[PDB]
Amino acid sequence: TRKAVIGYYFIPTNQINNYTETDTSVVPFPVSNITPAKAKQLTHINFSFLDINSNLECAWDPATNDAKARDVVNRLTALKAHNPSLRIMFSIGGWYYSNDLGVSHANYVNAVKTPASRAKFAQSCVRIMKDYGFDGVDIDWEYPQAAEVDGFIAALQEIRTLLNQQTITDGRQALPYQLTIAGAGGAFFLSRYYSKLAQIVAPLDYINLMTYDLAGPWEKVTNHQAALFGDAAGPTFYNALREANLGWSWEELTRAFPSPFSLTVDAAVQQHLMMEGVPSAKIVMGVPFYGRAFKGVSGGNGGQYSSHSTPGEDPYPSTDYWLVGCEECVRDKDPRIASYRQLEQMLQGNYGYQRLWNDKTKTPYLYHAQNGLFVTYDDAESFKYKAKYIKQQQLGGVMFWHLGQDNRNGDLLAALDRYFNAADYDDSQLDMGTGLRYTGVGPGNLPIMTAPAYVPGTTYAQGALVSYQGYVWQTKWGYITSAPGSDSAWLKVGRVA
Amino acid sequence: TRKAVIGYYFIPTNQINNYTETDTSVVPFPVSNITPAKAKQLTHINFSFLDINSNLECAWDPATNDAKARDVVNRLTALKAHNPSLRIMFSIGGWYYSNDLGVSHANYVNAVKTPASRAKFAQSCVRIMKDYGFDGVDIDWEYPQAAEVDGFIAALQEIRTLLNQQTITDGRQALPYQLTIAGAGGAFFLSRYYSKLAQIVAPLDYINLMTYDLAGPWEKVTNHQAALFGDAAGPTFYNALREANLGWSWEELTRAFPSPFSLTVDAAVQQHLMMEGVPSAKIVMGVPFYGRAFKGVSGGNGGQYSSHSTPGEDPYPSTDYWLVGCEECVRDKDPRIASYRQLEQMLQGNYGYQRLWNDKTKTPYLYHAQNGLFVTYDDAESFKYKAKYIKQQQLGGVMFWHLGQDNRNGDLLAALDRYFNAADYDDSQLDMGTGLRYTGVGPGNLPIMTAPAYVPGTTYAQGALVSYQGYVWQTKWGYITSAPGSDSAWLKVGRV
Ligand SMILES: NC(=[NH2+])NCCC[C@@H]1NC(=O)[C@H]2CCCN2C1=O
Ligand SMILES: NC(=[NH2+])NCCC[C@@H]1NC(=O)[C@H]2CCCN2C1=O
């Protein structure tokens, strides 16, 4: 099956209202930059962002000129002429609108509350989808938690029912309407809804993991924002999943959630796979088309894992733009983030950056010895390891944020497409390295094991293994006279064939 | 409130059937040995043991001669003439009958299975109580498993309903009929029903913890069987409670159940107090009136924490009665258990025993350097610290096994009564020592704390403290944007 390549097309309301394809100072990345070749390299474009209004229906930001919005969307759907597999999805939410303290958070919580609110909301998603010409619905609520998860699940199930009916009504069986969500790529936010992942993923075609932003100014030590595997030399973190409402024993929690652990892309993917009923084919690995920069770093390890003096507030509080050579940073007023396009230009501008590589995390980084800067980002090389991982782990594909940050030739997107589909690319001998793998095992994804059947009336010593009612169990202490499952003394450690 | 002093009176079926008070060779400890003065020092005598039969009803051993049984019970209830607060309870169960591999185990599991089986069983308990003249029901099932706990809880609730009705019908408002159980005194067995402790204790007047037998021949290294506090030099154990079906988070389990830990009396008591809904006044501390003996021990620590060669099987799988000086051990064909009465005689008989004292565990022990023997037991001295703990921790009182093991003068019982009630006994300066205390924190023993009220809309850093809905909470990581109870980033760490 072809791997998904899902690219976000993000355009702020002011750019839609003043949309033009001949002035990059107004619209830096118009749709015309997406050529037929690039359209063929994508399977999905996630147009972003729509929101949920106070009437609890999907809607465009009220400040949007509707004609101009339809025109931008039309330019995207016109790309379908070049690729009969391409879908132009629309994404509802995003951090700004849906985070706990975001402008529209309450609308997300309230829209998923009751059967009636969920029906009205779901109907509105399909109406916007058909009215504007989109091919599916993507929901990026960052992130539901607690008492909101059951409502969220039921809302997704309702949208799925409505989309499936629309597919039949429209005779779209050859390119059925789809439903996806953007999911957390790190344990802290993932812990909000982790316990119910199987129900969340059931109605979806894909769950697109935001497996980036795993390092940033909000952290004390500089680190790679999207390390594939872990570097024992780098910082480690508290495994928040150990605190999710799972109903697992201390041993089960400890085995599933090693802590501290390396916050990496492999950790997020493996954490999803540890849950019963979450298929690998629905998991999509997100990658960043931008880098994160830090100032005030020490030398020694190329700026890696160093203390730094980078402001964490949002927006960037100062007027000081210290990422040398990054003029895009001046335009956007923040020296802490730079598009791959810009970072590549900085490497061709003889500005004093060294492009370095960490062979454990399989990611590149920039180090500016003279000014003490460190930049963590991804490129065509790190994507070879990530694409190989997607293939080996049988994942659904790749998602990225965002199209406008690729260079002018679309090299990062071309690389991803190449690694999945080019007959002349051969990664059979690509060495995945010895970086740290996530080794948790969940009571939901135990290995096949074999042991003698439990014999009632027998007393077992500590460490004894038996098979009983579909699983292999091990005793945690001695003189065990109880049957497995029926008490605290036994630990499920494997599944019976 | 007077502390309970609950002493078991155990008499095997063959002794009831041949009951006599003038021949210690037949009945070593007849009811007449419980003089008026001893009767006044007890608040309860637990007559033991009755059982649950295949008919799923409370009942005596079938081999029991009922007329002799009634007569022994009448002698015990006659003691009430000497103490208006005394209750003669009867105990159903015990290890022999009710353990997982015991002869009557299935009857316990089956009796609590359904509303009908529970009603029939509860009724039989009250019928037996009234027919023989007992003052309450004590159940010693060792021990219901997770799946049987709901039925067990329901059975206790049904017995409580019937007993409360009987108290009113019999005009016993001044001395109500009571319901108690012997509960596990170690984490391993306690983990079977720990998660529902509040429900188990609700219908009871007391839960009598079997806070002894915490060391035995079944263990690799010798140890004190009822250390009050821990000795870092001694063995430590896996904290089975962290595996109970509590539904708690990793941090919550970890802070409540440190592992490994010291298996002590304090650990069991604190583990009970960690549960919300378990009142200290219902917890009764059990103490042994006997010691446990080990052979094959080596020197360096007076026999403590040593490997040994004592058979752990029951019955005693040999005929070698190696506990020098212990005559009762020959009578009972087991050298691994010796009553305090017998130990006291062994100490004054020049048999090679040295009495030593561990000041961390606050318990005595015997060491026999010549033959390599070790004996862990309790005495009037160890009871000073346990009595002070009972008072300080506001526990309900003490329980002990068994009356026939005290010496002829009843000194152990007199000591317990003195420590609780004597106007001229003053333990204000008794130093409780530096032994290890159990430090777990749970929902039932959160410390009082103060913190700023949680404010909706505020973002909190890691380690921040706030008060919300009556408790003080702390963040486990940073950038916390939702409320305690609705965001798993918060840990309840204090109350008020
Ligand atoms: N300044 C911010 N944090 N927000 C703007 C970045 C958009 C943010 N980043 C992302 O990678 C996309 C992926 C899905 C939803 N997203 C988001 O909400
Ligand atoms: N046959 C004997 N003398 N011993 C039987 C051991 C009794 C065993 N030990 C005890 O201390 C009592 C307390 C409650 C239940 N018990 C028990 O089941």
CATH value at residue B458: 2.10.10.20
Contact B185, B268 (CB under 8 A): yes
* Annotation marks residue B142 as catalytic: yes
Contact B218, A479 (CB under 8 A): yes
Cα–Cα distance, B231 to B233 (Å, whole number): 5
Q: Strands of B337-339's sheet, edge to edge?
A: B337-339, B290-294, B373-376, B363-368, B353-358
Residue A252 burial by Cβ neighbours in a 10 Å radius (0-12, 13-18, 19+)? buried
Tokens 């009215």 map to which residue? A131
Query: Do B150 and B193 lie in a common domain?
Result: yes
Query: Do A154 and A135 lie in a common domain?
Result: yes
Cα–Cα distance, B245 to A387 (Å, whole number): 42
**Does any CB of chain B come closer than 8 Å to the CB of residue A243?**
yes
Cα–Cα distance, A488 to B173 (Å, whole number): 41
Cα–Cα distance, A17 to B391 (Å, whole number): 78
**Closest Cα in chain B to A458:** B101
Q: Which of A101, A139, A210, A340 for mutating ligand 1's site (highest number of atoms within 8 Å of CB)?
A: A210
Query: Do A62 and A181 lie in a common domain?
Result: yes
C-alpha closest to that of A337 among A368, A292, A402, A375? A292
Cα–Cα distance, A59 to B62 (Å, whole number): 80
Residue after which a domain boundary falls, among B404, B419, B446: B446
3-state secondary structure of A398: strand
**Does any CB of chain B come closer than 8 Å to the CB of residue A476?**
yes
For residue A261, the distance in angstroms to the closest alpha carbon of chain B comes to 14
Region for B303 from its dihedrals, namely left if φ exceeds 0, alpha if ψ lies in -120 to 50, beta otherwise: left
Please tell me which of the candidates B247, B479, B487 has its beta carbon nearest to residue A145. B487
Tell me which amino acid residue A158 is.
E
Q: What one-character DSSP code corresponds to residue A338? A: E
Measured by CA distance, the residue closest to atom 4 of ligand 1 is A95
Judged by its nearest atom, the ligand closest to the C-alpha of residue A8 is 1
Q: Which residues make Cβ contacts (< 8 Å) with residue B493, sequence separation at least 6? A: B441, B446, B449, B465, B472, B473, B474
Task: Test A147 with B459 for CB contact under 8 angstroms.
Answer: no
Query: Do B3 and B33 lie in a common domain?
Result: yes
**Closest Cα in chain B to A459:** B101
Contact A230, A180 (CB under 8 A): no
C-alpha closest to that of B13 among B54, B68, B58, B57? B68
| Domain count for chain A | 3
Rounded (10°) CA dihedral A192, A194, A198, A202: 40
Chain A contact set for B192 (CB, 8 A): 482, 487-488
Query: Do B9 and B86 lie in a common domain?
Result: yes
Query: Do B356 and B394 lie in a common domain?
Result: no
Query: Do A272 and A171 lie in a common domain?
Result: yes
Query: Do A122 and A23 lie in a common domain?
Result: yes
Q: Strands of B490-495's sheet, edge to edge?
A: B465-468, B471-475, B490-495
CA of A95 to the centre of ligand 1 (A): 5
Task: Say what angle helices A380-392 and A265-273 make with each other, to 10 degrees.
Answer: 20
Chain B contact set for A256 (CB, 8 A): none
- The H-or-E segment that residue A117 falls in is helix A115-132
CA atoms within 13 A on the CB side of B308: 29
Contact B238, B259 (CB under 8 A): yes
C-alpha closest to that of B24 among B331, B321, B339? B331
Q: What are phi and psi of A436, to 5 degrees?
A: -70, 125
Judged by its nearest atom, the ligand closest to the C-alpha of residue B182 is 2
Query: Do A341 and A196 lie in a common domain?
Result: no
Contact A402, A289 (CB under 8 A): yes
Residues contacting ligand 2 via CB (< 6 Å): B 8, 10, 94-95, 140, 182, 210, 401
Residue after which a domain boundary falls, among A446, A464, A483: A446
Query: Do B334 and B426 lie in a common domain?
Result: no
Region for A162 from its dihedrals, namely left if φ exceeds 0, alpha if ψ lies in -120 to 50, beta otherwise: alpha
Contact A210, A400 (CB under 8 A): no
Method: X-ray
Cα–Cα distance, A272 to A210 (Å, whole number): 13
Cα–Cα distance, A379 to A355 (Å, whole number): 11
Which residues partner with B50 through β-bridges? B92
CA atoms within 13 A on the CB side of A247: 4
Region for B159 from its dihedrals, namely left if φ exceeds 0, alpha if ψ lies in -120 to 50, beta otherwise: alpha
Return the CATH number at A320. Answer: 3.10.50.10
Query: Do B230 and B342 lie in a common domain?
Result: no
> Would you state the structure tokens that stand for residue B381, as one six-digit string?
């001295």
Catalytic residue among B57, B142, B148, B158: B142
Cα–Cα distance, A398 to A40 (Å, whole number): 15
Query: Do B70 and B216 lie in a common domain?
Result: yes
Judged by its nearest atom, the ligand closest to the C-alpha of residue B28 is 2
Task: Test B218 with A487 for CB contact under 8 angstroms.
Answer: no
Cα–Cα distance, B237 to B239 (Å, whole number): 6
Q: Which residue range(s) make up the domain with B174?
A: 1-288+379-446
Return the CATH number at A49. Answer: 3.20.20.80
> Would you state the structure tokens that stand for residue A440, as one six-digit string?
């948790």
Which residues partner with A207 through β-bridges? A181, A283
Q: Which of A243, A246, A257, A263 to mutate to test the interface with B (most CBs of B within 10 A)?
A: A243
Contact A484, A469 (CB under 8 A): yes
To 5 degrees, how large is the angle CA B466–CA B472–CA B476? 70
Residue after which a domain boundary falls, among B360, B378, B396: B378
Contact B97, B131 (CB under 8 A): no
For residue A112, the distance in angstroms to the closest alpha carbon of chain B comes to 17
